């Protein structure tokens, strides 16, 4: 599913990500935009052989199991495929554990390079929330 910008902001809010660990909603929407262009089915292989899955490109090196990332963990206790669902519940729940790990949203390199310090409020401008 390719979400619309405000449609995604509303589902993220509903699921409790608005200000989670201090990160306003626009930060999560901006991260999603650049990680997956709002597409729940997005996947991208990393150089180390791990793969990133879903709207928030959660990696199989630590967070989900895909059966093909040697020596990796599955800290969110889920098959990586659950992260590609039209229902963002699994992605959000897993994102909450990632962002709580010590480095906040810096865990998403695209958020650090393209969203951090910018006017992320723009990402939820005009949305009925
Ligand atoms: Cl594996
Ligand atoms: Cl933080
Ligand atoms: Na894994």
Curated annotation (Swiss-Prot):
InterPro entries in alphabetical order: Glyco_hydro_22, Glyco_hydro_22_CS, Glyco_hydro_22_lys, Lysozyme-like_dom_sf
BP-aspect Gene Ontology terms: cell wall macromolecule catabolic process; defense response to bacterium; defense response to Gram-negative bacterium; defense response to Gram-positive bacterium; killing of cells of another organism
A Gene Ontology term for the protein's cellular component: extracellular space
Alphabetically ordered keywords of this record: Allergen, Antimicrobial, Bacteriolytic enzyme, Disulfide bond, Glycosidase, Hydrolase, Secreted, Signal
Annotated disulfide bonds: 6-127, 30-115, 64-80, 76-94
Tissue: In the egg white and polymorphonuclear leukocytes.
Domain C-type lysozyme: from-to ranges: 1-129
Active-site residues (renumbered): 35, 52
Substrates-to-products reaction catalysed: Hydrolysis of (1->4)-beta-linkages between N-acetylmuramic acid and N-acetyl-D-glucosamine residues in a peptidoglycan and between N-acetyl-D-glucosamine residues in chitodextrins
Gene Ontology molecular function, alphabetical: beta-N-acetylglucosaminidase activity; identical protein binding; lysozyme activity
EC number: 3.2.1.17
Family named by the database record: Belongs to the glycosyl hydrolase 22 family.
Subunit relationships: Monomer.
Designated name of the protein: Lysozyme C
Gene responsible for this protein: LYZ
């Amino acid at each position: 599913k390719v979400f619309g910008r405000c449609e995604l902001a509303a589902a993220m809010k509903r699921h409790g990500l608005d200000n989670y660990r201090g990160y306003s909603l626009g930060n999560w929407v901006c991260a999603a935009k650049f990680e997956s262009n709002f597409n729940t089915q997005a996947t991208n292989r990393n150089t180390d052989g791990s793969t990133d899955y879903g709207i928030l490109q959660i990696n199989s090196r630590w967070w989900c199991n895909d059966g093909r990332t040697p020596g990796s963990r599955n800290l969110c206790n889920i098959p990586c495929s659950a992260l590609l669902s039209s229902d963002i519940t699994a992605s959000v729940n897993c994102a909450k554990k990632i962002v709580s790990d010590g480095n906040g949203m810096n865990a998403w390199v695209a958020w650090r390079n393209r969203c951090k310090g910018t006017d992320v409020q723009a990402w939820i401008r005009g949305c009925r929330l």
